[PDB]
Amino acid sequence: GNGRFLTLKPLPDSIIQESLEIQQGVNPFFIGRSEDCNCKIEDNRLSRVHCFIFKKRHAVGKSMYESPAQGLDDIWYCHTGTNVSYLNNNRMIQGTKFLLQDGDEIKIIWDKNNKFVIGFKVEINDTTGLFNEGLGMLQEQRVVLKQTAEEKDLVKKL
């Protein structure tokens, strides 16, 4: 790749028919209305920085007998929007993180009454030493985590 690792493509199912590509070189990748975000998505419903994706070095506790990935990288999806995003089947509350498995469909905004439906398809084109690329790290099948100063710090300098 020339600098692209993950591809988030606002599919036709969403009001947006565009394709976004997270330049592996940029970490973390910010998405939202304001062009300031590495990704450009303007939806009056979401905030200037509705959400951002961050890549981190994947590492387990121990390797007794079995030898896991040892120490590779995994892409994380962070959400900071008020409308809360939805990843596949997990809820994303303002200040949450989620693993992005190859072919991860993330819902940025969904309105039942407003019929406002959004969603991006994550397609890993390049694997920057990815432990795998994003299969769900076994056992833990798609679980939502909380964000900390580390994540908030990245957006703070947005």
Binding site: N44, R45, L46, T82, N83, I109, N114, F116
Partner: peptide, 9 residues
Amino acid sequence: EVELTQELP
């Protein structure tokens, strides 16, 4: 001229 987030219920 807009600059607010339409937070849904």
